[PDB]
Write a protein that binds this ligand. Sequence first.
Ligand code: HEC
Ligand code: HEC
Ligand code: HEC
Ligand SMILES: Cn1cc(C(=O)N2CC(Oc3cncc(N4C(=O)c5ccc(Cl)cc5C4(C)C)c3)C2)cn1
Ligand SMILES: Cn1cc(C(=O)N2CC(Oc3cncc(N4C(=O)c5ccc(Cl)cc5C4(C)C)c3)C2)cn1
Ligand SMILES: Cn1cc(C(=O)N2CC(Oc3cncc(N4C(=O)c5ccc(Cl)cc5C4(C)C)c3)C2)cn1
Lengths: 473, 466, 464
Amino acid sequence: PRTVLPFEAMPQHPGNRWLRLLQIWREQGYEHLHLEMHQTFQELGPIFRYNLGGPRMVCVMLPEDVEKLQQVDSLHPCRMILEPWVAYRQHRGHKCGVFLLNGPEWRFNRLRLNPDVLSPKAVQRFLPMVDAVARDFSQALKKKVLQNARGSLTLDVQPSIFHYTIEASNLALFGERLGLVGHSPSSASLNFLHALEVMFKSTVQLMFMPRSLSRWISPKVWKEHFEAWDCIFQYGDNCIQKIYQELAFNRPQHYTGIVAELLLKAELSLEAIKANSMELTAGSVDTTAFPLLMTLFELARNPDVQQILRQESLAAAASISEHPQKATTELPLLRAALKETLRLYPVGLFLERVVSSDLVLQNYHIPAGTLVQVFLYSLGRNAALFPRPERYNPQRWLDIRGSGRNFHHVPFGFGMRQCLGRRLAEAEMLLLLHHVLKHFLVETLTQEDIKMVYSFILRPGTSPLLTFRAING
Amino acid sequence: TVLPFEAMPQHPGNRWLRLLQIWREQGYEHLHLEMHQTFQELGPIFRYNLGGPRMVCVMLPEDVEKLQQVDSLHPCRMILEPWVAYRQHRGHKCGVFLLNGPEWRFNRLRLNPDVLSPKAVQRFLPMVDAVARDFSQALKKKVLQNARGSLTLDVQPSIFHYTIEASNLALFGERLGLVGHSPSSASLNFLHALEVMFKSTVQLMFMPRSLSRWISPKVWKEHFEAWDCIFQYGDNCIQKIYQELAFNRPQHYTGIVAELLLKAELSLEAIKANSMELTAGSVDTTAFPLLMTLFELARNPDVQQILRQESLAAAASISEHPQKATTELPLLRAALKETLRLYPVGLFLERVVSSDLVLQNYHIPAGTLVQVFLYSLGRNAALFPRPERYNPQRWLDIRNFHHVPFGFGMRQCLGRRLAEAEMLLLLHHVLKHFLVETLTQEDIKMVYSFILRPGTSPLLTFRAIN
Amino acid sequence: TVLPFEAMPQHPGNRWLRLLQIWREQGYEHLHLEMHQTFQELGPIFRYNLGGPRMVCVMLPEDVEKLQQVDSLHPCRMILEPWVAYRQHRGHKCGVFLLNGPEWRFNRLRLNPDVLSPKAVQRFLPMVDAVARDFSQALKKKVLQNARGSLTLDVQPSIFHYTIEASNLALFGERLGLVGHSPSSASLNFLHALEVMFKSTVQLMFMPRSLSRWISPKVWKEHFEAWDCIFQYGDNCIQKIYQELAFNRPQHYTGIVAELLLKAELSLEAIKANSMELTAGSVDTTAFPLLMTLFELARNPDVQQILRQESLAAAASISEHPQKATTELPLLRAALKETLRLYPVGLFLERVVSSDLVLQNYHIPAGTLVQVFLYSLGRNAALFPRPERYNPQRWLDNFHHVPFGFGMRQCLGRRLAEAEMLLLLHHVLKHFLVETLTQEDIKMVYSFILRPGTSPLLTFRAIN
Ligand code: HEC
Ligand code: HEC
Ligand code: HEC
Ligand SMILES: Cn1cc(C(=O)N2CC(Oc3cncc(N4C(=O)c5ccc(Cl)cc5C4(C)C)c3)C2)cn1
Ligand SMILES: Cn1cc(C(=O)N2CC(Oc3cncc(N4C(=O)c5ccc(Cl)cc5C4(C)C)c3)C2)cn1
Ligand SMILES: Cn1cc(C(=O)N2CC(Oc3cncc(N4C(=O)c5ccc(Cl)cc5C4(C)C)c3)C2)cn1
């Protein structure tokens, strides 16, 4: 006859919003947030409350509490809206994308976005496009590799992977090749990458304090943040202005990208398409690129795992060449290697929901209005949910059909508000890795675990030196 | 009966208020719209208060006819003091634009056979054609890599690198590798140097050296630093061809400047001066009406398709004989006449008249500067029916002096024929492979910065024809 | 009757006036002309007032022959204090140039078989040849696009990117893609780092650590920042090959450094140190006499055509077997000897003598620094008739040719530099005529190495 306890009975985080914000001002970031939160779960248990003074905040981990959170997902799930991002759009007179929307406005936008961005039918249309970029990546790498006497190229792949994600995402969204794969990076691509870096750095700085504090504590950080958005929006509008003009004179019969479908359907206003198209263009660069580099590293660290994946990719090489759409079903262990990477290195770190109805999490009453934050780092590294958590084991995802481990894999979220660019990111990662495995051996002397850094998204601190050795002629 | 010079409507402006506005705004970007409004208010003729020197402003072709008859064996122009100041300073000879009297005529008569003449045009036409061919080829390559089989972009950077490439090949017989590749540091710094020099020319153009030396001392340094980059690029070209020709005198045609150096009718210093005037002079002037033709064809698809049909039928004869492009493409030649009617890069035709004359029944004395305004002339509804209508056919239906964007007589633009060939051939190869399109259906705001240039470059879609 | 050390003519200038001009002018650009004048006015031998330490300046090959006879098992060099200072600071081992005694001999004998030896030269010769072939091929492409079938340019940037490419391929078996393409940020920053290091070497060289600490404190930072860039580029090179070889030991030849790492006769730290000396050392040194050969051939068309006829006849055998380039081209090898006679990159040969010796009938005691001046030596009218004449034939008609030094301590990159020069020149002569109106001698500038002040405008005219 176990009694449900009140919200206040919950272990409280030893910290405070004030020390945190002064420290964030001093250090100009919160690079150690994941290790601070991870330690607190190791000390306080699977559930703890954060003292935001007035607002209630619950920190959870464990699929257990994710299932219950999905149960309370209303027809309009809520998320703690990102004030500095909203501040920019309100300033320059822009509409908000799905991520920065809540309530009916979010649902209207999402339902018109899902069929052309997330849906399986859409994935079958852009899969061959993404495949062509992935094919061009390995073929350019092969060209560089064969010019060296040892038939291998040792390098920092990070710059190439970013220019791959920019190229593949541009082709999938707009049906336009930027010429960044296999060539020198452009001023446009480098300034965009840098603008995204500055935007996230300044997001972390203006994030954990009210506009009443950040207006005088960090006035320079606001200008810095808005200048970063000015560059992000310059690049993004250039994209949309090109496709909008092209489609105005000729409505193509064939598939020419995601955004072409949205503009042709005209279910959303030009302003709403512009807003959501901006979220997709900018959003697909830093997010897909970091777990891709981590998969390449983890495979260079685990040659045993790498060779299992290579054998799969080489056997299924023929069918995928004919129908690139087969890559989804034909490569289970490579799909599972991405699940393993997103467990160890979750680039999204948290799943947040301002809960709309009272609920019970870990025998504590969580009232309506509480912001429930699921910590994907602690959830993934938990030894009880994942045996030998530190082991890179893609096999742990194969025979879990009826293991009740449905909520073990949540790096893209859950329900209606789950990541829109989930399917596009997965396709970009699968296909790059498939074509790399077919032609090269990934190697490294850097066996040491990479220190992750929190800069809005969980990114590695250092990029390791990866050797790409040619297999065949 | 005959009205005095003073009886003329006078411009409401001031020789000082304009001088201070140029000081404050660092340019006179709206000069064309200011002059156009004044003709709409004061009539076809008005005088400008220069506070001593006489200045007349005209806009009629009957006055353009009166001005050519009073042109001497040595036509006179108001010499550009800041440009002359730089050449005096660094010890350079003056090119045909900055010369007057016998020195101009000696230089011009040795320049015309190799630069302007029809026989010269037949020699560099195949050279220019190769660059134009390489432009569309590179554009096609970029276009075909996109899913919609089209490339929407700001063409302005490409068109400038085309004019630099085509002009370099025509003058020096040297490919710079700017067409279909990434712009070089040399080309970008040259383009920028030209923009500054043009900007700083306007800033010192309307005030005497006596005022501009203490009012705008930084603008003089800025202007001379700009010329230092322009002359650095130009001399590099000259010292390459001069060394190449010193060891081997080629049998075949290897450019305009090669002919001038081989003939040796003009001193090395005179060739250097005029060669500088051709290299620098061909980059911006040709590029602006080319972009305007591309835009005007993207807003007039009806006109564009008429030109395309002409270019596609005459495609074969121009492929075997590029020199046939001149006679085989009349409508496309007339479309350029139409770009220059509405968008005159030269804006004005100036002459310091040598003898008294009577323009619009007003006495214009000798020594009076006569300034023809090409913007207003081309926008006169009586001379050009529906003047704000891109109708290249209006140059075919003809039943004289209506087309003067390059000037008239002996002093007419020395680059007229090379510029025409560069425009005519780029457009021919673009029409054969692409459809030019734009949602920007609004007239571009033109900017005066010594030459009439567009303020904004529109977004042009180049759709592959098949 | 042998005279004492003190009886020798003394250099007129004091060490302090020289030290103050190096402070003021931020270099010693006229050193070669100052030393040349002193040999002209004093004789073939003169001592330098170091205010205690003994220093002898020689210019005759008869004296080189003698300086060699005392060399000993471990020849001693006047160690370059600012270079050693950087290594000691960042915790690096010293390369064979900055080493002395047994440590130098241990390093040298493990380096000679894979860097200097004839068997090694036969292994990297085809590699270097491929880069030289790519250079002329790229130049031909640019040349043929011009109406006069010629390209007039400043070759200096291309020659430097050739030496960087060829040396990288020979040492690491890696193509950087610098030949026939646009220069990279890595290559430009490296070139600039080497320039700043050689300039700040001269600035800190002629004064001790004590004076340079307060006279030129900014110059030390400048010098160490330059080395930081040189070492960044060099470690990137070695980190790549070390990782590649760790997973696969290649059966075929994949460069000089691959052999050193596979043999593992030297410690990783010693390989790192010597590999740094080879990577950085092969850029400026080889590039300056190469540009000087191209210039001297553009002013001597008569000599150029003699070399062209040789290169065109021997074109077939060198195409099949590139390793034949060494023996098949005697006049072209002699043209390099001729360029290094007039324009010696490494102006001096220095030795701190371990035993007493006699030079020009003067007693030179043990401990004495003996500096051979290669500029005056190669400009002596008695050893070389009509010395100003660029005549490679003189080398065909006994210590006369010593631009790489002598004995055990002679230039390690001597045979790699020769191969890089010979082959580039062979492929240029085959396809182009080198021409110039600049018929005036280039003013040389001492910047640790003897480099030209100005790069002339050279026309490369296609033959067919
Ligand atoms: C195409 C752009 C894009 C890419 C690529 C992308 N995302 Fe997202 N993601 C979104 C959008 C849009 C949302 C907003 C969800 C909403 O409110 O509808 C989102 C939301 C999320 C959320 C929170 C969802 C929730 O239920 O709270 C997570 C976690 C997430 N993304 C993780 C990722 C990860 C992991 C990757 C790749 C490694 C990724 N995303 C790549 C567009 C992107
Ligand atoms: C290759 C060089 C070059 C090009 C290209 C060039 N010009 Fe000229 N232009 C000149 C020179 C030189 C003069 C001076 C001629 C003289 O005094 O003998 C000149 C003079 C003029 C004049 C004054 C002529 C007069 O009679 O007063 C006008 C107007 C003119 N150019 C218009 C143009 C236009 C319009 C274009 C292109 C659409 C153009 N020019 C392109 C070299 C050039
Ligand atoms: C691959 C690198 C490399 C290149 C290229 C190179 N050197 Fe050397 N050089 C060295 C090294 C290493 C030493 C040190 C030799 C020692 O201490 O044993 C050296 C030493 C020398 C010495 C002193 C020899 C002595 O006995 O005193 C001279 C002289 C010299 N080099 C001249 C040259 C000249 C001239 C060139 C170019 C034309 C050149 N080097 C190119 C690596 C190089
Ligand atoms: C306490 N805290 C909350 C968060 C948080 O809300 N998120 C989601 C972040 O990761 C993400 C996952 N997917 C896409 C993203 N995006 C981007 O990277 C991006 C860039 C520019 C725009 Cl205009 C929109 C986006 C979106 C939002 C689309 C972020 C992690 C981080 N820390
Ligand atoms: C009240 N006012 C008079 C003018 C005027 O004199 N002109 C002529 C300007 O247009 C032009 C036409 N053709 C060639 C040109 N050139 C250039 O663009 C150019 C650039 C560098 C040099 Cl070193 C020489 C020239 C020349 C002069 C050759 C200009 C318009 C402008 N405003
Ligand atoms: C009174 N004085 C002595 C000298 C002197 O010792 N030398 C040798 C200099 O020329 C040379 C010949 N060969 C190779 C060289 N190198 C370089 O250029 C170089 C550059 C960077 C490094 Cl990390 C090592 C080297 C080495 C040392 C390899 C220099 C001239 C100069 N002035």
